[PDB]
């Protein structure tokens with residue numbers, strides 16, 4: 001059976017090839033997770049189809065209904081067999097889906113427009129002139145809502161009540177807002193994405209301060225999928241062989257234009 | 259039932275307290291893994307006894323007999339219920355034991371005596387005046403014994419054939435060898451241990467170069483153990499509370515004396 005892979009359009013993980021209208025199926029896409037999907041499928045011995053998550057979301061549970069959206073939702077409700085995307089391993093997600101060992105490390109980080117007078121999360125929390133926000137329906141927002149760490153809870157208190165809204169629906173929207181706002185919007189997003197964007201034209205953003213936490217992305221499968229075990233062994237093999245490092249280099253740094 | 263925890267004397271993960279005499283059982287020990295064990299035990303709801311691996315090794319499989327030694331062997335042969343130690347997640351181990359998601363990241367690194375004229379692994383490989391080696395029965399030696407990277411394979415060819423032997427039985431022996439060889443021995447070990455030692459008196463070693471790979475330590479249980487699931491959930495939770503970040507600062511940065 002063709003394994004249905006859910007993923008998300010997020011650079012440089014999955015992107016539309018420039019001539020994708022003349023290509024078919026998996027060939028329409030390129031990027032880190034496209035290359036990785038090919039390798040996981042080869043080492044696990046399955047055929048597969050890449051499908052972009054319909055609602056364009058990573059995955060969170062609605063607080064009132066308790067329905068999961070995004071890629072998590074496609075797995076939970078049986079629409080996809082596997083997710084190969086920059087999907088963060090979290091405890092609440094682990095209650096409903098399974099994750100491989102992580103294939104890439106990351107932490108929450110701060111993106112500013114160059115010259116913004118902020119060097120840290122503590123800096124951000126202590127002022128109001130520069131607004132700051134995070135992506136909707138993702139692990140970064142949930143991180144702040146739940147955190148018991150003084151500085152991060154102070155940030156949550158501000159963000160949840162800030163008007164106009166400081167949350168964005170896609171990473172690209174957040175990045176554009178940073179670039180537009182003349183230094184008055186900072187964006188909280190994962191270090192991997194922050195680092196990619198810093199090396200992309202117009203080279204007008206940068207990552208400041210240390211990461212706020214330390215986690216990783218995992219390949220996710222529905223609970224009790226037969227695929228879980230083989231996928232995990234494939235991730236370990238590819239790490240040890242050096243593939244993951246090679247792919248990071250290909251899509252981040254060899255890709256660099258600043 | 260009291261859970262038998264296997265671990266290994268390795269700073270700053272598990273150390274006999276200087277002062278101890280009036281202490282018994284688990285109380286004799288201190289360290290990152292000692293603190294982590296107490297947290298895992300509290301979140302999983304079990305009592306436990308810390309035991310130091312009998313053969314003082316992490317664990318490797320004998321090529322001729324296929325018997326596993328070290329902490330891995332203690333799990334495989336049913337001599338302990340769980341290992342809580344800086345035990346590297348590897349493909350060959352995952353075939354015989356289960357690991358939690360990683361609780362700490364590390365990479366292979368180079369330790370020199372300060373002033374040694376080496377800045378990289380490439381430097382080591384291209385010369386012969388300065389000897390170099392690694393720990394026996396651990397993941398670092400296997401890394402080299404398997405690597406296809408030109409520089410690392412060149413290092414392997416040298417190390418496996420060097421006389422006298424460049425391999426050591428314990429990390430402490432490796433560190434002593436660096437300290438007392440006047441810059442003529444360099445030691446390959448994990449970044450975590452290297453960075454700890456660099457901030458300890460006599461402050462005469464340092465980490466040079468970047469890491470050679472990127473991996474993680476996991477909590478290990480015997481295949482199919484009934485502890486596995488609860489332990490993984492606990493590592494997830496401790497990470498998201500930040501407790502793991504807190505213990506890292508306690509045992510690395512608060513321990514600095516240089």
Ligand SMILES: NC(=O)COc1c(F)cc(SCCNS(=O)(=O)c2ccccc2)cc1F
Nearest residue numbers: 102103104105215216359472473474494497
């Ligand atoms: N390519 C790689 O080597 C990346 O793999 C790793 C790794 F080896 C270690 C870590 S430590 C950070 C926490 N480990 S986790 O991401 O599996 C996690 C996430 C949330 C709760 C508990 C544990 C990270 C990597 F990505």
Ligand SMILES: N[C@@H](CCC(=O)O)C(=O)O
Nearest residue numbers: 058086087088138139140
């Ligand atoms: N990687 C995140 C999405 C990005 C973010 O939340 O910053 C997740 O899995 O939800």
Ligand SMILES: N[C@@H](CCC(=O)O)C(=O)O
Nearest residue numbers: 316344345346396397398
């Ligand atoms: N962490 C290693 C031990 C130290 C080393 O090999 O450098 C292991 O689990 O085997």
Ligand SMILES: [Zn+2]
Nearest residue numbers: 039042043238
């Ligand atoms: Zn391959």
Ligand SMILES: [Zn+2]
Nearest residue numbers: 274276278279
């Ligand atoms: Zn004593």
Ligand SMILES: [Zn+2]
Nearest residue numbers: 297300301501
């Ligand atoms: Zn606790």
Ligand SMILES: [Zn+2]
Nearest residue numbers: 320321322323
């Ligand atoms: Zn033998």
